[PDB]
Amino acid sequence: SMSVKKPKRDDSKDLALCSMILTEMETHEDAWPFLLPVNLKLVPGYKKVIKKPMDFSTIREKLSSGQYPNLETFALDVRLVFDNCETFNEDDSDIGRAGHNMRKYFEKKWTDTFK
Template sequence: MDLRTMLNKLKNHQYDSPTEIRDDARLMFTNCRTYNEDGSDIFECATRLEAFMEERFAHAFGENGRKRRTL
């Protein structure tokens, strides 16, 4: 998974729920760390962006996973 694929899925209305977007974002970060060396710029940027997005997801979804407000 990558950002371009996610953007294309958004444009083509291929997501049925916000949780699908969240799941694809998490997969993207996992892939980024898997295919880039620990300590590399890309690895570190992915780690920081993931922390930011997880904070936003927590505010948007709450503890039970249901959407509370827009990102």
Template sequence: MTSAVLSGRNEVHHHRWGDARIPLMPKPSNPNPRRHRPSPNPSPSNPSAAAALDVPEPSQSGHVTIRPSELSRREAQALRTRLTGELGRVRALLSHIDSWEEQRRPADPQQRHHVSPPPALQAAMRKRCTQILTRLRKQKISVWFNSPVDVERLKLHDYHAIIRNPMDLGTVKENLAFGRYPSHEDFATDVRLTFNNALRYNPADHHVHRYAGNLLATFEGLYKEAVSWFEQECQHLARQ
């Protein structure tokens, strides 16, 4: 599974709540299912099920033609599962790329010497982050991510070997409420970590993997709007 290293909180381009340029629980009893690890070369007991996962060879142009009307019910279900899993991986990779590009982008010289935004604007941005988190947590599928993974009860013996930095939306909510995030970059990093952990641990064809990809995409859209608003407000203050 494709993965990328998340940005740490000590990156050179890390910005505080007051900076102008910003890149940046319902409690379930089963936040993440056990990851099933197939053998490297499995021998399917059901040959027809294995055949259902076959996809036609691409043409010379690199395109694959699939005719739904020619697929059996089992083949259609298998193809849907495969494509949905790949979509989740693509969304996660795009999130990593966006974060990496933002971290690598040089600071605008006009913004390096700006006057720090007033406390009221900083508080407004924190409020927007809280609203984003609330919207995520209210979604039905977020029940898998609203509290820490109960590793002991679920007997996920390999969880901490795979996930070195566990995170969940309930912990993010607590950190945000108690002012533990120096900037909204830190807030965004932990939200992304929550979903990227689920994408990393759960197989691509598992529903938790798909839910994580969907919620991550939702978060990125909401967060981008909030950051755009904050940057515009900071630029307005800088011109005064």
């Protein structure tokens, strides 16, 4: 509350560390469905169904230009990519499986880096 603060967690390396995590997601072999925005002209249904499209390139641009106020807003966009994938793709598809694998991979790096 006013003039009463918990001790200051050092957040000065968060930008650099989220960048490294993102690099590792970008270079994973199962990243291919997630590297670029889904083409909304060419994928019937995507525009109407997926209210908030997100992909690694868009996260990368937001990160590079100071559009994440903190590390949690960054994690929310990453998770949004996998949540969208689950909403549109059958679990037993290459893209559905890619999504489950990438989410697992991300959540481990996230815990190991920050928890």
